[PDB]
């Protein structure tokens, strides 16, 4: 595909069929949203008000 097309989200879904498969269809998906990310901000609050999430 054109490189401009992949930059925008089209979800590029992959679909396959095989004999030894339960649904006869396995759906796989790659896009720009899902992948190896450049930045990771894992944010934890040491909250005391519990039971409300």
């Amino acid at each position: 595909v054109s490189e401009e097309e992949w930059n925008t989200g089209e979800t590029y879904t992959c679909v396959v069929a095989h004999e030894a498969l339960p649904n006869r269809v396995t759906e796989r998906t790659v896009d720009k949203s899902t992948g190896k990310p450049t930045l990771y901000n894992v944010s934890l609050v040491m909250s005391d008000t519990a039971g409300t999430c």
Partner: protein, 106 residues
């Protein structure tokens, strides 16, 4: 602008990914995961059993929660237990409401 992939309630994880739109250039734009996980920090290991000690080790398997006794209470569901009650010689077991606003009569 962020897609919330996985939002598990007990682990209270929020698996969501965002992409920062770059300027007019070849693409080196930054892909991020906006994961924001919250600890109860005072809940017990057996969430249904009130008589449990404090839990210290919180194990957060991020791949597992995408698809195990769970950490924090959910206001939508009820986590209830039974407690004995005595007025005398007789013993009666009565269900109790561990958390308010979740099992309130509606």
């Amino acid at each position: 602008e962020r897609i919330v992939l996985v939002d598990n309630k007990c682990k209270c994880a929020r698996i969501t990914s965002r992409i920062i739109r770059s300027s007019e250039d070849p693409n080196e734009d930054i892909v991020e995961r906006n994961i924001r996980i919250i600890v109860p920090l005072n809940n017990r290991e057996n969430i249904s059993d009130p008589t449990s000690p404090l839990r210290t080790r919180f194990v957060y398997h991020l791949s597992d929660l995408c698809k195990e006794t769970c950490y924090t209470y959910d206001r939508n569901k009820c986590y209830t237990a039974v407690v004995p009650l005595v007025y005398g010689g007789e013993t009666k077991m009565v269900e109790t409401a561990l958390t308010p606003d979740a099992c309130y009569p509606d």
